[PDB]
mmCIF file of N, CA, C and O in Angstrom:
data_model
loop_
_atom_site.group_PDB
_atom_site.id
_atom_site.type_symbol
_atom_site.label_atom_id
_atom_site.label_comp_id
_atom_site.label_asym_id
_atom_site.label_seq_id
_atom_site.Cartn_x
_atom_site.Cartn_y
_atom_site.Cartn_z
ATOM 1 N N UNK A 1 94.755 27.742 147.763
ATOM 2 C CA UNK A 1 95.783 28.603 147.121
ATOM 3 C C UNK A 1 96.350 27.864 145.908
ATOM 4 O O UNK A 1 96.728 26.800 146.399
ATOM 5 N N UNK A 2 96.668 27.824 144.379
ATOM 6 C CA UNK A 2 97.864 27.673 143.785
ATOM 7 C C UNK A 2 99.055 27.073 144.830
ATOM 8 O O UNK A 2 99.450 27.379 145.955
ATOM 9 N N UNK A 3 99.432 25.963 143.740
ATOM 10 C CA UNK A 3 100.399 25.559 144.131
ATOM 11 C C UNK A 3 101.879 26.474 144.586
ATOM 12 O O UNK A 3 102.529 26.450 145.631
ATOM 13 N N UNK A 4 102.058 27.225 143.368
ATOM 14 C CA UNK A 4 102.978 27.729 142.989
ATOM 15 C C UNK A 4 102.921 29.184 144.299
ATOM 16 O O UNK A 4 103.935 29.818 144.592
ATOM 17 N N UNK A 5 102.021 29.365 144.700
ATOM 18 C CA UNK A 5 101.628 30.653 146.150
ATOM 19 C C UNK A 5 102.455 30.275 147.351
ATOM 20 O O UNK A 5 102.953 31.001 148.212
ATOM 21 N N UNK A 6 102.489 28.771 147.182
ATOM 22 C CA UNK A 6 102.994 27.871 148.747
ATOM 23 C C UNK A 6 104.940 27.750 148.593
ATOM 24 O O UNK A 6 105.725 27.220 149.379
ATOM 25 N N UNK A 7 105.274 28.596 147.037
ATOM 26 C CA UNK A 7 107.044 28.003 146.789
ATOM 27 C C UNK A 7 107.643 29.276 147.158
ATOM 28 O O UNK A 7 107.220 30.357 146.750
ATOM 29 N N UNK A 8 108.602 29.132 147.913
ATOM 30 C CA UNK A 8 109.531 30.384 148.731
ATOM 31 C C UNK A 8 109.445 30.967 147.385
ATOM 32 O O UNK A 8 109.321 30.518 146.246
ATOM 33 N N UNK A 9 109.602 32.616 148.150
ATOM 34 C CA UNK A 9 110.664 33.708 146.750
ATOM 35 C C UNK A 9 111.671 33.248 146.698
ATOM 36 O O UNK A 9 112.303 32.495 147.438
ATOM 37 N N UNK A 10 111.947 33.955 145.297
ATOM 38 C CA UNK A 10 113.210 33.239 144.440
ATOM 39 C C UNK A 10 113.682 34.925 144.260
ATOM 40 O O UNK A 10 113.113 35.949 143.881
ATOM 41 N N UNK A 11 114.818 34.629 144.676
ATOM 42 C CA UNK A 11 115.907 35.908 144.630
ATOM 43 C C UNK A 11 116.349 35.531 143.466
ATOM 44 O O UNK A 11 115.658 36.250 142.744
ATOM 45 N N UNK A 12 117.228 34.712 142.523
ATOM 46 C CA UNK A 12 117.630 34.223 141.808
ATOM 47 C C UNK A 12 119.161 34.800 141.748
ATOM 48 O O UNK A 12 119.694 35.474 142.629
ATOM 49 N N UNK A 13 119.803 34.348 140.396
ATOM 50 C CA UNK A 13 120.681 34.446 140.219
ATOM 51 C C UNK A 13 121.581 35.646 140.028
ATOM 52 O O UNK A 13 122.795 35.620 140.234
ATOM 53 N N UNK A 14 120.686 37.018 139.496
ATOM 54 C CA UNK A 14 121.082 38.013 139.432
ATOM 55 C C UNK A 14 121.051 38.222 140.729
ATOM 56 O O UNK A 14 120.649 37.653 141.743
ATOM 57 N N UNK A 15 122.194 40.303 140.074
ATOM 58 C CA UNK A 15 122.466 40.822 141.273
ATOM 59 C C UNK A 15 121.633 41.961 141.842
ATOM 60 O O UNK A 15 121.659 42.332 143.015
ATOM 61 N N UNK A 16 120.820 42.517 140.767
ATOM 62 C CA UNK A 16 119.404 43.370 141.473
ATOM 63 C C UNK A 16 118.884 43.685 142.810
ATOM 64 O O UNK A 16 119.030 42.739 143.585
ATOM 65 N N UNK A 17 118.590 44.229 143.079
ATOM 66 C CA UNK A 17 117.992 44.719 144.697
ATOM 67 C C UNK A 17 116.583 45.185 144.331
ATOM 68 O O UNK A 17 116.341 46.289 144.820
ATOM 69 N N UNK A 18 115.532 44.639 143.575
ATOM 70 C CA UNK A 18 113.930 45.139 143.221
ATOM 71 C C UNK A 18 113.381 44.402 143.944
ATOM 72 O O UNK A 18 113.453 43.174 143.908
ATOM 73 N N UNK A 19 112.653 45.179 144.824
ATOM 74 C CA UNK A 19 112.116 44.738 145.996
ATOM 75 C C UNK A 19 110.467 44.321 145.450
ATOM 76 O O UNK A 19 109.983 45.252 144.806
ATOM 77 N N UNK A 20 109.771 43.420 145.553
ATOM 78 C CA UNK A 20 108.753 42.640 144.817
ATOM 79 C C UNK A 20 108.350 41.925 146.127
ATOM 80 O O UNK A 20 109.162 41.548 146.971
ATOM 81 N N UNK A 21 106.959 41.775 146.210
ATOM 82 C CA UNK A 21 105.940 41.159 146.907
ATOM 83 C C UNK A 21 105.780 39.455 146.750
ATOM 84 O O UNK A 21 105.502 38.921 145.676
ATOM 85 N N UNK A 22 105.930 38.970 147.581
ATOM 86 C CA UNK A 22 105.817 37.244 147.390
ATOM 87 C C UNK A 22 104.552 37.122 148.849
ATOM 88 O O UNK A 22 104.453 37.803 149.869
ATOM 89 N N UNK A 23 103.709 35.899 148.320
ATOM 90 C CA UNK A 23 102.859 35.635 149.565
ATOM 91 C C UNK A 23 103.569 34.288 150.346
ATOM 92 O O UNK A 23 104.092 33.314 149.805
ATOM 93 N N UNK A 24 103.384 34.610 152.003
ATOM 94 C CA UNK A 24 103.855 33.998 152.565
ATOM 95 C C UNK A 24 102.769 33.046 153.425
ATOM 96 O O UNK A 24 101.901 33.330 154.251
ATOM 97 N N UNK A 25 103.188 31.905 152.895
ATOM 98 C CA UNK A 25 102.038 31.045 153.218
ATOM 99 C C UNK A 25 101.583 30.689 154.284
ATOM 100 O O UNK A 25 100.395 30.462 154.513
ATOM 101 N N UNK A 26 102.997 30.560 155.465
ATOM 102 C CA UNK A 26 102.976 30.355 156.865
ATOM 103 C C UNK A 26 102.457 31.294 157.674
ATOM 104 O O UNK A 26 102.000 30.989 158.775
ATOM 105 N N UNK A 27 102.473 32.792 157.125
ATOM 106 C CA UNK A 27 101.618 34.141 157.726
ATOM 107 C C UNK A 27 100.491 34.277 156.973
ATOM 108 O O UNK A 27 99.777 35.107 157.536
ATOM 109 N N UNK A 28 100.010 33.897 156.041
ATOM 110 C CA UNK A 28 99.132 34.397 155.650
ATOM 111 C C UNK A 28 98.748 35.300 154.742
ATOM 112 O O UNK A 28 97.633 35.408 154.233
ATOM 113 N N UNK A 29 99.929 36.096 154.512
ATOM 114 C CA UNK A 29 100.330 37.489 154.131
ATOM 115 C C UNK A 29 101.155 37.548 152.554
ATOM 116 O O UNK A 29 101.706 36.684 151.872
ATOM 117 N N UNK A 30 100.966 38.752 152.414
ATOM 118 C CA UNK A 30 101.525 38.914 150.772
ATOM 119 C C UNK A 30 102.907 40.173 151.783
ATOM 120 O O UNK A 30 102.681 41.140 152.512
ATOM 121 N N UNK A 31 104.242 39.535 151.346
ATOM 122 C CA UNK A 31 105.110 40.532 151.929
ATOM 123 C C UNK A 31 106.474 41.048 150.955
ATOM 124 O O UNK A 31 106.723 40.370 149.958
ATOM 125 N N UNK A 32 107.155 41.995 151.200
ATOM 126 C CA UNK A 32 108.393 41.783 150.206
ATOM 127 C C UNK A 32 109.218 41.216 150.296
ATOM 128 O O UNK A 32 109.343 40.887 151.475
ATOM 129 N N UNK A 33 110.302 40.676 149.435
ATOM 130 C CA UNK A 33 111.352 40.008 149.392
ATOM 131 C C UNK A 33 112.203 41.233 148.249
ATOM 132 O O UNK A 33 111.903 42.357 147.845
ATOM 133 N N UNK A 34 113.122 40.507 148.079
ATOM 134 C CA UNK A 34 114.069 41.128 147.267
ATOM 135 C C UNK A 34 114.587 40.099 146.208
ATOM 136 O O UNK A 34 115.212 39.095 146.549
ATOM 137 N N UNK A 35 114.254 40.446 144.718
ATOM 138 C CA UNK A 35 114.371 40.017 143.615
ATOM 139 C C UNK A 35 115.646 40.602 143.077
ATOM 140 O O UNK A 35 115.843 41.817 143.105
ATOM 141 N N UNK A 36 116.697 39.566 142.482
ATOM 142 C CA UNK A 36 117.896 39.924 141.363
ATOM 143 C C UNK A 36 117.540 40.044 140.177
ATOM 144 O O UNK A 36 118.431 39.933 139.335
ATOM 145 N N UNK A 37 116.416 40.256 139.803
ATOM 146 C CA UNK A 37 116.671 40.609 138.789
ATOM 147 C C UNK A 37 116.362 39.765 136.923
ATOM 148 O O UNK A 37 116.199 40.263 135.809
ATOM 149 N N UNK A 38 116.392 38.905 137.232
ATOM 150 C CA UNK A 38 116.413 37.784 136.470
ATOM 151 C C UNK A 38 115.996 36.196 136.904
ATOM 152 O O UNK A 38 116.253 35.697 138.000
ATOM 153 N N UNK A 39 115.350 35.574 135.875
ATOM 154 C CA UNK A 39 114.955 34.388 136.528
ATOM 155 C C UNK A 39 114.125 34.129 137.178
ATOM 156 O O UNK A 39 113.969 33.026 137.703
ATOM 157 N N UNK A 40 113.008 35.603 137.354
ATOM 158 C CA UNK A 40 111.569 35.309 138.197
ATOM 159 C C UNK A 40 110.759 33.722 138.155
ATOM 160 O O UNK A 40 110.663 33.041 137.134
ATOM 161 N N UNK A 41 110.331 33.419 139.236
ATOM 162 C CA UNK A 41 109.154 32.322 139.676
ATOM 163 C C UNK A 41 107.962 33.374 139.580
ATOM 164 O O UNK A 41 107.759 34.567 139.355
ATOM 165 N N UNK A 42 107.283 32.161 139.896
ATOM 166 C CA UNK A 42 105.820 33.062 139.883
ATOM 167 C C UNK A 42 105.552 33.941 141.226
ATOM 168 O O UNK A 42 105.472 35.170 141.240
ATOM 169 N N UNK A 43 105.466 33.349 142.003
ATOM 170 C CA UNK A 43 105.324 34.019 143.604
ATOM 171 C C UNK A 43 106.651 35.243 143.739
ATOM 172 O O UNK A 43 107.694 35.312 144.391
ATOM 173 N N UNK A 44 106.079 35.953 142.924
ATOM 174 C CA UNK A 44 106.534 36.999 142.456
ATOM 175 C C UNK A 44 106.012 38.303 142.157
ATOM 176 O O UNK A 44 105.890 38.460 140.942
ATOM 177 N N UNK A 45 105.698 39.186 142.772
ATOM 178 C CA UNK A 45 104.327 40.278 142.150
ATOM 179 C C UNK A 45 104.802 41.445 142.573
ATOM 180 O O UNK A 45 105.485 41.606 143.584
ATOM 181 N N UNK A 46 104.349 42.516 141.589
ATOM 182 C CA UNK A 46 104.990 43.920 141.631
ATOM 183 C C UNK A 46 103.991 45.145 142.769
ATOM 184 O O UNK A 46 104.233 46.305 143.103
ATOM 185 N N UNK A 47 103.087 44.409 143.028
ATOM 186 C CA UNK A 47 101.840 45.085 143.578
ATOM 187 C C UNK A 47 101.262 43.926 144.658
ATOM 188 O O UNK A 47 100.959 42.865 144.113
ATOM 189 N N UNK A 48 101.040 43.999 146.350
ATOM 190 C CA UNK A 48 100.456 43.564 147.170
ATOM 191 C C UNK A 48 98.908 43.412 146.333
ATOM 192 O O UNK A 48 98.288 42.439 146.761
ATOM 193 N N UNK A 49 98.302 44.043 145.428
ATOM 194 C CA UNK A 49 96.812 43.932 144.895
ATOM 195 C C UNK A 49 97.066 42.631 144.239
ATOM 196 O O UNK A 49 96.363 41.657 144.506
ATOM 197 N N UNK A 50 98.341 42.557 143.132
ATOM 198 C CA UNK A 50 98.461 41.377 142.635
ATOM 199 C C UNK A 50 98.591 40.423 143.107
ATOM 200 O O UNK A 50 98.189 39.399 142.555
ATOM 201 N N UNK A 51 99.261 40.405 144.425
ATOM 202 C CA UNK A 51 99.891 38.997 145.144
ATOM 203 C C UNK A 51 98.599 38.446 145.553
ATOM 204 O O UNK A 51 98.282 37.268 145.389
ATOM 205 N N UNK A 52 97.588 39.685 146.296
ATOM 206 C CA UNK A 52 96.274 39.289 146.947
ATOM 207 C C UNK A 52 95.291 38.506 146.498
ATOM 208 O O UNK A 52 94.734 37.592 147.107
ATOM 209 N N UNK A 53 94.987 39.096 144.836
ATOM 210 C CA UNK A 53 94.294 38.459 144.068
ATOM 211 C C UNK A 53 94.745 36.648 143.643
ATOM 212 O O UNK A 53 94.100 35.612 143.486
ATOM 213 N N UNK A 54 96.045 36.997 143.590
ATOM 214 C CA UNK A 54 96.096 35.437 142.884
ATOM 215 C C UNK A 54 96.475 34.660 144.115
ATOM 216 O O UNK A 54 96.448 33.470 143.803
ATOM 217 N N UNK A 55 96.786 34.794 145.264
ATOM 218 C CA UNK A 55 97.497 34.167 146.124
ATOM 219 C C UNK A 55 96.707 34.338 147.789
ATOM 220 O O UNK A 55 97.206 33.905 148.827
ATOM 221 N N UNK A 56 95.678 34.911 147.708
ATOM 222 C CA UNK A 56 95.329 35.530 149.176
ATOM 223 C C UNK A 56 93.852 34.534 149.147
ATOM 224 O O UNK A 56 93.136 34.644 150.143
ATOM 225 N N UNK A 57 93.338 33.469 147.912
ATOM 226 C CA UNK A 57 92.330 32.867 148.392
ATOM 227 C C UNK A 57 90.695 33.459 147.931
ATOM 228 O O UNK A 57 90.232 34.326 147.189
ATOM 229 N N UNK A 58 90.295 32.628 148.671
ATOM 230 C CA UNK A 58 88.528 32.815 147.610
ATOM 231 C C UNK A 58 87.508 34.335 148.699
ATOM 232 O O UNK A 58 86.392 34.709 148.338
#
């Protein structure tokens, strides 16, 4: 996996409620979290297709 696949979601600093896909490394799985809005990380994706591709492995 990318390094960056294995770093918790980042809610960040805003106050937003956009619910966005992060992969979870300990399941296995691409799941949602809830994004503020501002200040995205990478493990961050608007689409489970996206999280899969970059984060789900060969």
């Amino acid at each position: 996996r990318p390094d960056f696949c294995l770093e918790p979601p980042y809610t960040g600093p805003c106050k937003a409620r956009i619910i966005r896909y992060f992969y979870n490394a300990k399941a296995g799985l691409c799941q949602t979290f809830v994004y503020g809005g501002c200040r995205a990380k990478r493990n961050n994706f608007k689409s489970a297709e996206d999280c899969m591709r970059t984060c789900g492995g060969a």
